[PDB]
Amino acid sequence: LHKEPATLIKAIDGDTVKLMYKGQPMTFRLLLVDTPEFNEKYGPEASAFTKKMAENAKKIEVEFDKGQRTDKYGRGLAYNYADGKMVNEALVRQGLAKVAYVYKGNNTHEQLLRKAEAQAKKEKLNIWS
Numbered sequence: 001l002h003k004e005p006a007t008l009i010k011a012i013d014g015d016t017v018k019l020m021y022k023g024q025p026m027t028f029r030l031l032l033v034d035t036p037e038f039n040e041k042y043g044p045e046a047s048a049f050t051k052k053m054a055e056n057a058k059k060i061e062v063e064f065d066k067g068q069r070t071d072k073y074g075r076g077l078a079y080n081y082a083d084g085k086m087v088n089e090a091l092v093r094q095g096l097a098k099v100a101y102v103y104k105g106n107n108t109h110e111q112l113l114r115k116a117e118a119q120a121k122k123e124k125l126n127i128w129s
């Protein structure tokens with residue numbers, strides 16, 4: 001896989017963000033994760049976490065997997081990086097997302113993310129508390 005440039009247009013919530021990619025505005029949905037909706041417990045905290053990570057970044061990147069690049073709602077499906085740190089992994093490691101939506105052929109980072117999840121569960125963080 002390879003990282004490609006993007007810029008932040010606006011934070012949306014824990015697992016979606018509006019980015020400019022190839023010069024066009026798109027909503028991205030983070031691969032392999034599920035954050036609570038803003039209305040649910042830890043939803044606001046997941047939102048804040050990804051808003052801060054994206055807004056403080058000097059360099060946002062997206063990385064597509066081998067499979068589908070957009071979902072049925074037209075959202076881009078990617079791993080999102082903020083100054084080299086994967087947002088998808090960081091959410092899972094902090095117990096603010098669960099590993100989820102693992103579809104065959106878009107699952108390159110699955111085991112990385114499951115190892116973070118095991119760590120967050122051991123530490124009893126957030127969703128695992």
Ligand SMILES: Cc1cn([C@H]2C[C@H](OP(=O)(O)O)[C@@H](COP(=O)(O)O)O2)c(=O)[nH]c1=O
Nearest residue numbers: 029030031032033034071072077101103106
């Ligand atoms: C993360 C992900 C979600 N989706 C679709 C499955 C879910 O369909 P349904 O809307 O029919 O439940 C929805 C979950 O996204 P959200 O968690 O953002 O709601 O998005 C994909 O198709 N591919 C993906 O990789």
Ligand SMILES: [Ca+2]
Nearest residue numbers: 034035036037
């Ligand atoms: Ca969600």
